Design a protein around this ligand. Structure first.
Ligand SMILES: *[C@@H]1O[C@H](CO)[C@@H](O[C@@H]2O[C@H](CO)[C@@H](O[C@@H]3O[C@H](CO)[C@@H](O)[C@H](O[C@H]4O[C@H](CO)[C@@H](O)[C@H](O)[C@@H]4O)[C@@H]3O)[C@H](O)[C@H]2NC(C)=O)[C@H](O)[C@H]1NC(C)=O
Ligand SMILES: *[C@@H]1O[C@H](CO)[C@@H](O[C@@H]2O[C@H](CO)[C@@H](O[C@@H]3O[C@H](CO)[C@@H](O)[C@H](O)[C@@H]3O)[C@H](O)[C@H]2NC(C)=O)[C@H](O)[C@H]1NC(C)=O
Ligand SMILES: *[C@@H]1O[C@H](CO[C@@H]2O[C@@H](C)[C@@H](O)[C@@H](O)[C@@H]2O)[C@@H](O[C@@H]2O[C@H](CO)[C@@H](O)[C@H](O)[C@H]2NC(C)=O)[C@H](O)[C@H]1NC(C)=O
Ligand SMILES: *[C@@H]1O[C@H](CO[C@@H]2O[C@@H](C)[C@@H](O)[C@@H](O)[C@@H]2O)[C@@H](O[C@@H]2O[C@H](CO)[C@@H](O)[C@H](O)[C@H]2NC(C)=O)[C@H](O)[C@H]1NC(C)=O
Ligand SMILES: *[C@@H]1O[C@H](CO[C@@H]2O[C@@H](C)[C@@H](O)[C@@H](O)[C@@H]2O)[C@@H](O[C@@H]2O[C@H](CO)[C@@H](O)[C@H](O)[C@H]2NC(C)=O)[C@H](O)[C@H]1NC(C)=O
Ligand SMILES: *[C@@H]1O[C@H](CO)[C@@H](O[C@@H]2O[C@H](CO)[C@@H](O)[C@H](O)[C@H]2NC(C)=O)[C@H](O)[C@H]1NC(C)=O
Ligand SMILES: *[C@@H]1O[C@H](CO)[C@@H](O[C@@H]2O[C@H](CO)[C@@H](O)[C@H](O)[C@H]2NC(C)=O)[C@H](O)[C@H]1NC(C)=O
Ligand SMILES: *[C@@H]1O[C@H](CO[C@@H]2O[C@@H](C)[C@@H](O)[C@@H](O)[C@@H]2O)[C@@H](O)[C@H](O)[C@H]1NC(C)=O
Ligand SMILES: *[C@@H]1O[C@H](CO[C@@H]2O[C@@H](C)[C@@H](O)[C@@H](O)[C@@H]2O)[C@@H](O)[C@H](O)[C@H]1NC(C)=O
Ligand SMILES: *[C@@H]1O[C@H](CO[C@@H]2O[C@@H](C)[C@@H](O)[C@@H](O)[C@@H]2O)[C@@H](O)[C@H](O)[C@H]1NC(C)=O
Ligand SMILES: *[C@@H]1O[C@H](CO)[C@@H](O)[C@H](O)[C@H]1NC(C)=O
Ligand SMILES: *[C@@H]1O[C@H](CO)[C@@H](O)[C@H](O)[C@H]1NC(C)=O
Ligand SMILES: *[C@@H]1O[C@H](CO)[C@@H](O)[C@H](O)[C@H]1NC(C)=O
Ligand SMILES: *[C@@H]1O[C@H](CO)[C@@H](O)[C@H](O)[C@H]1NC(C)=O
Ligand SMILES: *[C@@H]1O[C@H](CO)[C@@H](O)[C@H](O)[C@H]1NC(C)=O
Ligand SMILES: *[C@@H]1O[C@H](CO)[C@@H](O)[C@H](O)[C@H]1NC(C)=O
Ligand SMILES: *[C@@H]1O[C@H](CO)[C@@H](O)[C@H](O)[C@H]1NC(C)=O
Ligand SMILES: *[C@@H]1O[C@H](CO)[C@@H](O)[C@H](O)[C@H]1NC(C)=O
Ligand SMILES: *[C@@H]1O[C@H](CO)[C@@H](O)[C@H](O)[C@H]1NC(C)=O
Ligand SMILES: *[C@@H]1O[C@H](CO)[C@@H](O)[C@H](O)[C@H]1NC(C)=O
Ligand SMILES: *[C@@H]1O[C@H](CO)[C@@H](O)[C@H](O)[C@H]1NC(C)=O
Ligand SMILES: *[C@@H]1O[C@H](CO)[C@@H](O)[C@H](O)[C@H]1NC(C)=O
Ligand SMILES: *[C@@H]1O[C@H](CO)[C@@H](O)[C@H](O)[C@H]1NC(C)=O
Ligand SMILES: *[C@@H]1O[C@H](CO)[C@@H](O)[C@H](O)[C@H]1NC(C)=O
Ligand SMILES: *[C@@H]1O[C@H](CO)[C@@H](O)[C@H](O)[C@H]1NC(C)=O
Ligand SMILES: *[C@@H]1O[C@H](CO)[C@@H](O)[C@H](O)[C@H]1NC(C)=O
Ligand SMILES: *[C@@H]1O[C@H](CO)[C@@H](O)[C@H](O)[C@H]1NC(C)=O
Ligand SMILES: *[C@@H]1O[C@H](CO)[C@@H](O)[C@H](O)[C@H]1NC(C)=O
Ligand SMILES: *[C@@H]1O[C@H](CO)[C@@H](O)[C@H](O)[C@H]1NC(C)=O
Ligand SMILES: *[C@@H]1O[C@H](CO)[C@@H](O)[C@H](O)[C@H]1NC(C)=O
Ligand SMILES: *[C@@H]1O[C@H](CO)[C@@H](O)[C@H](O)[C@H]1NC(C)=O
Ligand SMILES: *[C@@H]1O[C@H](CO)[C@@H](O)[C@H](O)[C@H]1NC(C)=O
Lengths: 120, 435, 120, 120, 53
């Protein structure tokens, strides 16, 4: 039930502990300690900025409008979620990541402009 | 059709090299600098995690090395500089009841010291160990201190102990330390049982050479760990599963006197010896030691041929700092001869007494530009330590000798079970779910 | 009308100056000043992370789905919001605060998973 | 197309590169390196806090309920948004900025209270 | 230049010129003459745009 306790568990189970890990991201001699504190903050902020860009701000589980091109992983939703741990999944699809992130950004840009045009 | 879902707080990590900070539990040494620890912080079992560990490529070792050396140097900054004392010393033999083993080991020297006033000098008569002085320019009685032809000597502050107070290493937020709990783990490769911790256990920063003192013991059996076992250029770290007790002494009742050499600057020196003059020494139980080596041999035979011969021998060379067992015993620095421990061949309430030398002017780290003078200690010194591991090097018949000159090996023997990783909480997966 | 000006006023009045206080949370010799700046940031981020966990991101007034078990405070609205100042309230229900925060976290986790299965 | 590439283009074009600039806002000898990193964070957080105050958290484009008083600028929608760059616009309405920010803050406070009452 | 050194203190070395091998001559720098004259001519042409022509 503690931090990373679910690391060896299946994705379909581990997804229920997202708040456990989220809360462990924040908190001359003494300078290296300041450097460590500053980078912990900078890494945190980059993840939050990215969620903001994608339109996932404020939530731990974010559904999007980008579809899963099978060429990323042609495995099925009883294998990805019941037979694989997040560590194994991350390795499987680590190559095709800066494609997915790019697509998520593009999708959100279109959603913002379409939403302004409706509110008119 | 499956659509991309973004998850944040995902239990994923990657190998990482980051800055660790120190912490401690609750006469100042290796403290103030570290944050007080949390009681029983946490340990999470991570039941189904298998992970790869690789000691020797572990940067936690380099950080511990840097912190110890830096804190060591910091502690000498406010202490008295013994540069006014780089003079001609006139030295003669010691007029006491000296055993044969100590002949030539001590000298009674007389020097002119500086005083509180710039225009005045005094005449001080002190005992020195032979190892701290050097004769000069073809003059029978004229000596100088060993390190006045290199670095300035700094006297260590008399109020500062060198007690190896344990230091804990803690991860910054966003990072975690993984701990290998496999009792058979040899320092590398997959570890089937890996838990997560906040901060490592405290490790005592004990500084020694060929015999590792007061460390962790193996849980079940002697473990031999080496970067490449068939490469004779590598050191072998042998962890014992049982301690071997070693009793060390400096059996001479010393009188320590002090003078001012400057404006509030005190110098400490051995004034005189009460009673007989004897050699410092260490006692190792003979039977315990022979059992210990037999276990080491049985394990060496799993890497070397089985129907083989294993030989133990004394170091073939190098200076006193690496050919002996160096350690701090009650504030004094001992250099003990271990040839009595490693003189046997193993083929397919008695004790061993190790004679010891004492030095007051030491270098600690393998550096050129620093020296330090350890004030002598009043009375008689005794200490008892646990031998928890050996550092061996290797030349049919495989011959092994004591090594350990490189301090990072001592720290590897405690940090081998820890790995630093970075948490990577953001990731994606297909789910049947679209905005 | 300035910072903490409403501290002595009733909760029902003080609730209208939330932006006044929110704006005062952000901004060897010189090191302790740098340390102070870093910790001010860390405290700010922890509060924001917590609001995000509860589903209150981006807002000063957040209604939730957790009910008020009377055992924490059995006073009526026209006491809590007309008489007591926030300082007196904070003392009254200081003890039972980690319990409320835990409930808010669980409530949001249930809500995020229910929504995922309504967009299916 | 890179950082500030659109600076010389018209507002109506530049508005499509908002993510390009947003992504470039984050990341004794050497102490100044930490000072620089800390201030970058502080400036970032102030912008995010302000968007939160106005109810624009999580978005790069945010429509509001505050109307454009002609006194700020009487230029018609196709002299601003396809004849004028963002640099020239900022100069045109520099004096009248703090007014707008104050109005946006008031608008959001009115919006948060009204919503709360509707969820009773 | 033949360089010698002495110790002046505990690990403190001082370096100095011991002596000179060969003749003692003055240090100097060489600037090509025509190149320098062309360089100034260009500078002068530009100065004349701020000063009278
Ligand atoms: C391996 O671990 C053992 C066990 O911890 C360790 O032995 C210990 O060494 C310390 C330091 O020499 C001993 O502490 C002293 O004990 C004597 C008892 O007579 C006291 O008088 C001493 O106090 C005086 O000196 C202090 C110096 O710092 C002053 O601060 C103080 O005010 C007094 O003037 C001091 O308490 C300790 O007793 C032993 N422990 C045992 C069980 O013998 C050993 O040194 C470690 N080995 C290595 C290599 O680190
Ligand atoms: C090393 O040399 C020094 C200097 O010679 C020796 O110290 C001296 O030792 C003698 C004999 O113990 C001292 O004489 C005694 O003086 C006291 C009064 O101080 C007196 O009560 C005794 O009856 C005796 O006369 C002498 O003072 C002392 N000098 C100093 C500076 O302390 C030292 O003992 C020698 N060490 C050895 C063992 O070689
Ligand atoms: C789905 O992917 C296929 C194959 O794309 C390749 O693998 C991807 C992971 C990525 O690395 C692509 O850049 C690779 O080309 C796509 O088919 C190709 O698409 C690209 C444009 O992205 C095009 O230039 C190629 O000609 C296409 N042909 C192949 C087989 O290489 C397919 O278009 C992708 N579908 C989606 C939803 O974008
Ligand atoms: C409402 O609270 C009661 C009792 O409240 C407990 O003590 C209060 C002062 C405060 O600390 C509450 O948070 C505590 O829960 C609950 O009744 C008890 O509930 C606990 C589990 O929470 C259970 O173990 C006990 O057996 C229950 N019995 C007692 C001693 O009253 C009640 O369940 C809470 N109801 C709601 C709606 O949450
Ligand atoms: C729209 O602006 C006019 C002009 O206001 C001036 O310029 C503004 C940018 C701002 O700086 C104002 O403070 C300036 O007075 C406003 O007309 C005046 O508004 C002020 C303040 O309300 C009032 O005292 C004057 O009597 C008004 N004069 C007139 C000619 O009516 C007008 O109120 C603004 N409208 C809105 C929507 O706020
Ligand atoms: C280390 O071992 C030696 C040898 O056993 C010990 O020396 C004996 O000490 C007792 C007590 O003072 C004497 O009665 C014996 O005569 C000594 N033996 C010899 C051969 O001289 C020594 O005490 C032990 N000590 C340590 C490490 O302090
Ligand atoms: C430890 O003591 C032994 C003696 O038992 C020393 O070994 C001798 O070393 C000399 C060279 O200096 C050789 O000529 C002798 O043959 C060696 N003797 C034996 C029995 O092998 C050893 O050098 C000492 N080591 C240290 C570090 O002091
Ligand atoms: C998911 O896949 C299960 C196994 O299918 C077979 O093995 C995998 C590794 C692939 O090679 C696949 O093409 C093979 O057919 C099936 O038993 C299960 O029913 C599948 N579920 C869904 C929803 O498709
Ligand atoms: C609110 O309560 C005031 C005090 O009366 C009582 O004590 C409090 C703690 C509550 O338990 C309440 O239910 C009790 O009646 C009353 O004077 C006042 O009339 C009450 N007002 C309302 C709107 O109920
Ligand atoms: C917009 O107006 C143009 C003329 O601009 C006039 O002066 C500027 C400074 C503003 O005050 C503006 O409101 C004035 O009307 C016309 O040339 C242009 O055709 C107009 N365009 C539209 C879309 O009506
Ligand atoms: C570990 O795997 C076993 C199946 O081999 C499974 O029953 C168990 O629940 C898993 N443990 C965790 C923590 O997921
Ligand atoms: C995946 O399913 C197979 C089925 O044979 C099982 O043996 C394996 O342990 C499962 N792995 C996990 C991570 O649950
Ligand atoms: C990613 O690319 C590397 C290229 O060296 C390759 O070795 C690895 O297997 C790839 N992983 C996949 C298929 O995602
Ligand atoms: C010193 O040794 C001699 C024998 O050489 C002995 O007669 C004398 O008593 C001893 N002195 C002391 C103080 O033990
Ligand atoms: C003094 O010690 C030296 C060895 O360093 C020895 O040769 C000499 O004979 C000794 N002199 C006396 C008087 O003991
Ligand atoms: C100091 O003198 C000794 C004499 O044995 C010599 O070996 C050493 O190299 C000298 N050190 C320096 C720094 O000159
Ligand atoms: C030596 O080992 C014994 C084993 O019983 C232990 O109690 C003792 O504390 C150890 N000593 C040191 C200094 O670690
Ligand atoms: C350590 O274990 C690994 C397991 O893969 C083995 O290959 C290696 O030879 C072992 N080394 C030693 C010194 O035991
Ligand atoms: C170990 O040493 C041998 C020496 O012959 C060398 O050939 C081999 O590549 C080394 N292996 C590793 C892992 O360093
Ligand atoms: C060390 O001293 C203790 C008494 O404190 C004794 O029981 C033990 O046998 C001695 N150890 C050795 C190796 O002599
Ligand atoms: C090595 O010898 C031991 C007995 O001491 C035996 O159990 C083991 O099987 C032998 N190993 C090999 C490879 O013969
Ligand atoms: C090794 O043991 C033999 C036993 O006969 C002894 O003669 C020899 O001197 C010893 N060597 C060392 C270095 O102690
Ligand atoms: C050293 O000698 C003095 C003589 O006054 C005595 O009081 C002290 O106890 C002795 N110390 C030791 C360790 O023998
Ligand atoms: C302070 O209390 C009085 C009633 O005694 C009330 O009229 C006044 O408005 C209150 N002031 C504030 C800031 O709440
Ligand atoms: C508020 O306080 C006043 C004075 O104690 C009291 O008269 C009034 O009834 C209280 N109002 C309520 C119901 O909270
Ligand atoms: C809060 O806890 C403290 C310590 O247990 C207790 O003294 C106090 O009465 C409690 N207050 C409330 C509001 O229950
Ligand atoms: C610069 O102006 C020209 C002419 O209107 C236009 O075609 C070009 O796209 C403009 N450059 C940018 C970066 O907008
Ligand atoms: C720019 O503004 C001028 C003046 O109103 C106008 O004549 C021109 O048509 C405008 N151009 C565009 C592209 O809006
Ligand atoms: C803003 O005010 C200053 C000072 O009155 C004035 O010089 C400037 O022109 C004004 N600018 C605008 C945008 O009106
Ligand atoms: C500098 O030396 C080089 C040698 O190759 C020569 O060609 C050049 O002309 C010299 N420069 C001057 C200014 O004399
Ligand atoms: C420099 O340029 C002037 C131009 O008037 C010319 O008269 C003179 O001879 C030139 N000198 C050299 C060295 O070329
Ligand atoms: C200076 O003289 C040059 C060369 O005749 C001519 O081109 C230039 O225009 C003149 N400038 C002025 C300011 O007279």
């Amino acid at each position: 039930l503690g931090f990373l306790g679910a690391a060896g568990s299946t994705m379909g189970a581990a997804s229920m502990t997202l708040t456990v890990q989220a809360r462990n991201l924040l908190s001359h001699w003494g300078i290296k300690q300041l450097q460590a504190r500053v980078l912990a903050v900078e890494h945190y902020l980059r993840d939050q900025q990215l969620l903001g860009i994608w339109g996932c701000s404020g939530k731990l589980i974010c559904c999007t409008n980008v579809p899963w091109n099978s060429s990323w992983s042609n495995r099925n939703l009883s294998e990805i979620w019941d037979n694989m741990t997040w560590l194994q999944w991350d390795k499987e699809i680590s190559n095709y990541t800066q494609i997915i992130y790019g697509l998520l950004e593009e999708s959100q840009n279109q959603q913002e402009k379409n939403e302004q045009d409706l509110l008119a | 059709n499956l659509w991309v879902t973004v998850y944040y707080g995902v239990p994923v990590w990657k190998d990482a090299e980051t800055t660790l900070f120190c912490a401690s539990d609750a006469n100042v040494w290796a403290t103030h600098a570290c944050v007080p620890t949390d009681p029983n912080p946490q340990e999470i079992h991570l039941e189904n995690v298998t992970e790869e560990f690789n000691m020797w490529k572990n940067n936690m070792v380099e950080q511990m090395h840097e912190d110890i050396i830096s804190l060591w140097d910091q502690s000498l900054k406010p202490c008295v500089k013994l540069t006014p004392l780089c003079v001609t010393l006139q030295c003669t033999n010691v007029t006491n009841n000296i055993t044969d083993d100590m002949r030539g080991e001590l000298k009674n020297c007389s020097f002119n010291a500086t005083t509180e006033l710039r225009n005045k000098r005094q005449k001080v008569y002190s005992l020195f160990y032979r190892l701290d002085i050097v004769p000069m320019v073809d003059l029978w009685t004229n000596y100088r201190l060993i390190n006045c032809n290199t670095s300035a000597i700094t006297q260590a502050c008399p109020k500062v102990s060198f007690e190896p107070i344990p230091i804990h290493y803690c991860a910054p937020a966003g990072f975690a330390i993984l701990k290998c709990k496999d009792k058979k783990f040899n320092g590398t490769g997959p570890c089937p049982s890996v838990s997560t911790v906040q901060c490592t256990h405290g490790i005592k920063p004990v500084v020694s050479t060929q015999l590792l003192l007061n460390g962790s013991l193996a849980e079940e059996e002697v473990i031999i760990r080496s970067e490449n076992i068939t490469n004779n250029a590598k050191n072998i770290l042998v962890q014992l599963n049982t301690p071997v007790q070693i009793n060390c002494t400096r059996p001479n009742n010393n009188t320590v006197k002090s003078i001012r050499i400057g404006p509030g600057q005190a110098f400490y020196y051995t004034g005189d010896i009460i009673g007989d003059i004897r050699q410092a020494h260490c006692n190792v139980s003979k039977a315990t030691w022979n059992e210990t080596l037999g276990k080491v041999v049985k394990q060496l035979r799993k890497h070397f041929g089985n129907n083989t011969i294993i030989r133990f021998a004394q170091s073939s060379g190098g200076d006193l700092e690496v050919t002996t067992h160096s350690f701090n015993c009650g504030g004094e620095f001992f250099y003990c001869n271990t040839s009595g421990l490693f003189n046997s061949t193993w083929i397919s309430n008695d004790s061993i007494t190790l004679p010891c030398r004492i030095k007051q002017i030491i270098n600690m780290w393998q550096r050129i530009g620093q020296a330090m003078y350890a004030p002598p200690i009043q009375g008689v010194i005794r200490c008892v330590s646990n031998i928890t591991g050996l550092i061996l090097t290797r030349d049919t018949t495989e011959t092994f000798r004591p090594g350990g000159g490189d301090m990072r090996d001592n720290w590897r023997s405690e940090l081998y079970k820890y790995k630093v990783v970075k948490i990577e909480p953001l990731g994606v997966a297909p789910t049947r779910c679209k905005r």
